[PDB]
């Protein structure tokens, strides 16, 4: 439904998996090799289910900024037998605002879901579920339970992962290229 829905669909088909923790199912974005991202409130353990396959977690790191503030992103290395397509070239280098974004979700209960959210604001600080959080993007769509881990894109950029909402607005944690230098 535009170059943006074409790009969102390409990212969902090749670079997402369904991740299940004790906290439910999440859209999980694969970034390169066996490295993926998920919201930190998924509470990733030693074992995770990936497309309903029991998978060992080789490493999991909840990112914080250099002020020691939550970013709500956990980077996970999976003991999976297959690598992701490398999409690090689609990650922005800096904090920014965006036009005409799409939020895309794929879980067992929420498959094949694409949401045009429009304008994305570099919001910055959010008290997210009582936790001070930085590098938040905001869009004016009444997102619900189900969309956590959803991927926010524009044409040719993967810009964030959905982490919350207040009934009127939705919030995503930024993805930056510098998080995934090996």
Instruction: State the residues that interact with ligand TZ9 by CB under 6 A.
Output: 1-2, 5, 110-113
Q: Which is nearer to ligand TZ9, 43 or 99 (CB)?
A: 99
Tokens of 150: 């959803």
Residue 129: CB partners within 8 Å, gap ≥ 6? 41, 164
Q: Which is nearer to ligand TZ9, 7 or 84 (CB)?
A: 7
Respond yes or no: is residue 41 known to be catalytic.
Answer: yes
Distances in Å between the alpha carbon of 83 and those of 9, 15, 157, 182? 19, 10, 20, 15
Q: Which is nearer to ligand TZ9, 114 or 179 (CB)?
A: 114
Nearest distance in Å: CB 13, ligand TZ9:
14
Respond yes or no: is residue 177 known to be catalytic.
Answer: no
Q: What's the sign of the alpha-carbon dihedral 41, 29, 76, 159?
A: negative
Respond yes or no: is residue 148 known to be catalytic.
Answer: yes
**Catalytic residue positions?**
41, 72, 148
């Amino acid at each position: 439904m535009g170059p943006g829905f074409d790009f969102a669909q390409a990212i969902m088909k090749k670079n997402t998996v369904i991740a299940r923790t004790e906290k439910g199912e999440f859209t999980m974005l694969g970034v390169y090799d066996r490295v993926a991202v998920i919201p930190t409130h998924a509470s990733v353990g030693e074992i995770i289910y990936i497309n309903d396959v029991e998978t060992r977690v080789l490493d999991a790191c909840a990112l914080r900024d250099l002020t020691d503030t939550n970013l709500e992103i956990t980077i996970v290395k999976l003991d999976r037998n297959q690598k992701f397509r490398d999409i690090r070239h689609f990650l922005p280098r800096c904090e920014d605002d965006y036009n005409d974004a799409v939020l895309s979700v794929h879980t067992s209960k929420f498959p094949n879901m694409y949401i045009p959210v429009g304008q994305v604001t570099n919001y910055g600080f959010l008290n997210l579920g009582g936790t001070p959080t930085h590098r938040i993007l905001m869009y004016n769509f009444p997102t619900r339970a189900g969309q956590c881990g959803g991927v926010v894109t524009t044409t040719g950029k993967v810009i964030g992962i959905h982490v919350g909402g207040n009934g009127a607005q939705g919030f995503a944690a930024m993805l930056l290229h510098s998080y995934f230098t090996d």
